[PDB]
Amino acid sequence: FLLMCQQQMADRNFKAALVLAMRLIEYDDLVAPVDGYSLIALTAYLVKNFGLCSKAFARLEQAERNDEAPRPFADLARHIFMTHSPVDTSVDSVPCPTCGSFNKEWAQRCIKCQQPFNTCIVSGCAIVSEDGAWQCSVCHRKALEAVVDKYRNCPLCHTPRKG
Amino acid sequence: HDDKAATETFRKAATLTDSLDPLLGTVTCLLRQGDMEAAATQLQLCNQLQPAAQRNAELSMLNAQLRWHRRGMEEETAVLRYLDQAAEAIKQDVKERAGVGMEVYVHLNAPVALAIAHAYIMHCRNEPPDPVVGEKCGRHLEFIVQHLPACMEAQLMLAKVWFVTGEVRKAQNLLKSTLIVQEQPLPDAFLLSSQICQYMGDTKLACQALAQARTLDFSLQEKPLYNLLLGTVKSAATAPSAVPETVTLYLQLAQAQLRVRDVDAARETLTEAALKFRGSAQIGRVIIAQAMLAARTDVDKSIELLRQVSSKSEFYIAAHSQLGKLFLTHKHNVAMYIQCFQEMAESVPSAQSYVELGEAYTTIQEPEQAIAAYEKAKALSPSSSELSVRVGRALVAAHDYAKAIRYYQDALV
Ligand SMILES: [Zn+2]
Ligand SMILES: [Zn+2]
Numbered sequence: 001f002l003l004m005c006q007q008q009m010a011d012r013n014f015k016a017a018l019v020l021a022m023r024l025i026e027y028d029d030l031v032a033p034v035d036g037y038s039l040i041a042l043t044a045y046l047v048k049n050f051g052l053c054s055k056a057f058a059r060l061e062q063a064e065r066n067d068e069a070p071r072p073f074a075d076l077a078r079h080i081f082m083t084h085s086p087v088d089t090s091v092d093s094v095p096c097p098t099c100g101s102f103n104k105e106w107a108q109r110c111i112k113c114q115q116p117f118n119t120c121i122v123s124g125c126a127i128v129s130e131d132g133a134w135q136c137s138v139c140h141r142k143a144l145e146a147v148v149d150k151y152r153n154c155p156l157c158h159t160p161r162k163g
Numbered sequence: 164h165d166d167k168a169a170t171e172t173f174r175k176a177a178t179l180t181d182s183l184d185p186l187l188g189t190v191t192c193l194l195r196q197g198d199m200e201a202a203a204t205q206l207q208l209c210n211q212l213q214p215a216a217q218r219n220a221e222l223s224m225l226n227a228q229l230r231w232h233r234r235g236m237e238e239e240t241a242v243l244r245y246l247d248q249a250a251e252a253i254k255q256d257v258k259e260r261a262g263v264g265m266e267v268y269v270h271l272n273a274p275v276a277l278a279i280a281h282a283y284i285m286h287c288r289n290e291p292p293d294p295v296v297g298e299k300c301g302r303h304l305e306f307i308v309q310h311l312p313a314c315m316e317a318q319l320m321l322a323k324v325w326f327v328t329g330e331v332r333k334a335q336n337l338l339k340s341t342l343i344v345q346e347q348p349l350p351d352a353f354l355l356s357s358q359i360c361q362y363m364g365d366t367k368l369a370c371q372a373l374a375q376a377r378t379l380d381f382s383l384q385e386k387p388l389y390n391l392l393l394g395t396v397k398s399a400a401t402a403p404s405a406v407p408e409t410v411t412l413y414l415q416l417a418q419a420q421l422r423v424r425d426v427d428a429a430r431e432t433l434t435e436a437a438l439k440f441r442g443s444a445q446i447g448r449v450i451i452a453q454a455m456l457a458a459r460t461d462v463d464k465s466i467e468l469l470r471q472v473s474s475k476s477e478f479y480i481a482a483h484s485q486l487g488k489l490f491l492t493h494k495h496n497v498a499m500y501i502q503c504f505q506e507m508a509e510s511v512p513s514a515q516s517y518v519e520l521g522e523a524y525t526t527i528q529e530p531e532q533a534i535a536a537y538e539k540a541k542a543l544s545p546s547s548s549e550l551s552v553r554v555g556r557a558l559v560a561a562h563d564y565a566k567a568i569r570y571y572q573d574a575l576v
Binding site: 054055057058059061062077078081082086111114 | 498528530560561562564
């Protein structure tokens with residue numbers, strides 16, 4: 001996720017950047033959370049949304065307080081929280097395909113029926129309909145048709161299409 | 164303790180004059196020898212010979228003594244009444260005969276009066292409180308100690324229950340002061356005192372405390388207690404003729420099988436002792452010990468063990484207090500974690516629960532819910548000002564700097 005999460009700013013479609021960035025929470029062991037939460041707060045600011053940025057800044061500042069025992073992320077957190085309204089925007093925009101419950105776009109499981117969803121390999125959104133789901137036969141991953149039609153190769157394995 | 168020959172002596176003495184007190188001497192020594200039938204039959208006779216209002220002191224003991232071995236676990240309340248029936252009487256019948264000391268000590272019978280402290284302590288807890296029967300155990304000892312402060316035998320039981328006090332600084336000085344002046348008794352309180360210091364965080368002296376018990380004799384190792392406590396800072400348990408005392412022995416076994424990394428032996432003694440000690444009122448600790456191992460064996464079997472305890476157990480919420488801990492770093496659960504902490508918050512409400520459920524909301528990084536749970540922790544107790552500090556720290560960590568000012572001003576009011 002990290003590569004396209006960082007280059008999504010170059011791709012200028014900053015909406016999918018947060019969807020990518022909120023997928024590495026479970027991957028804090030492989031990549032240190034101080035690396036990812038910076039990007040999470042950055043893309044939260046760039047789309048002018050909040051709430052998740054508050055959690056990211058809180059974890060970052062707890063890490064800083066663990067470190068010192070002069071930090072600028074406290075300055076950034078306080079400056080943004082006082083110069084802007086720190087309230088979470090709309091985050092439930094996808095319903096569960098099984099029980100109809102609206103869940104987070106970055107949710108790995110349903111909040112109601114607890115059913116895992118396969119996530120898109122490039123946009124990061126959880127797939128709800130298998131009709132618009134493209135399954136890779138080599139790296140065994142799934143993505144969305146509307147984005148995978150643009151890419152002639154898989155983002156993971158870059159498997160050529162047989163013809 | 165010339166029990167067998169003096170048993171006939173009482174039978175002679177009971178025949179010389181039939182009196183309740185020397186008859187209860189016969190019952191006492193028959194209990195040591197094993198004739199519970201003759202011990203039970205004459206308990207009935209002395210119950211009928213009971214003085215109607217001033218109930219006899221040693222009569223309630225022979226009630227408590229006989230029943231303790233078998234019925235005492237089921238009569239953990241009822242024998243405690245028979246404990247109380249003479250414990251207050253010895254407080255009172257001696258007070259009825261005060262003034263001249265000769266009446267005081269003849270109705271004292273300190274070996275009986277000290278046996279009350281022996282009976283009380285095994286009925287009471289072995290663990291210090293968090294950051295009444297224990298006090299009831301603690302009140303009668305200071306009653307025993309105040310009149311004759313010199314005796315170390317009453318001191319050691321008193322110095323023991325000072326572990327329950329929670330005045331750790333005033334305790335460990337008193338634990339140290341009495342043990343250094345009086346050298347004859349067993350030093351195992353020195354280890355226990357230093358382990359309270361390590362429990363606070365004071366570990367530097369605890370390494371040397373191990374040698375201090377070791378200094379007197381190798382005979383301590385006849386108790387396997389020391390060898391574990393030796394390893395803490397850095398045959399016997401089966402017990403045939405070759406219960407809370409065995410519960411402390413089971414704590415020894417639990418930490419031993421924790422350190423040794425034996426899986427089969429640990430599970431085998433878990434099953435065996437749980438089979439033998441299922442009727443005890445402590446097996447919840449046992450099973451969560453199982454759970455603290457069952458996390459490395461099977462999560463769902465651990466959850467079933469956690470469900471094998473009812474709300475009547477004091478460790479049960481402690482069980483759930485660690486069942487929630489099962490979702491800390493191993494299950495990594497969110498919805499189930501919130502569910503469990505809500506269940507234990509509603510089951511036994513308290514400010515601390517309202518604190519740790521707030522901790523649960525800090526585990527999932529929900530600011531507003533953490534604010535609310537800490538706010539009702541503040542609301543539940545005026546004794547939560549030390550927790551209100553944590554409430555303030557969580558809300559400033561929850562970015563609510565607009566209302567942080569108002570919470571702080573109102574808390575300062
Ligand atoms: Zn669902
Ligand atoms: Zn692929």
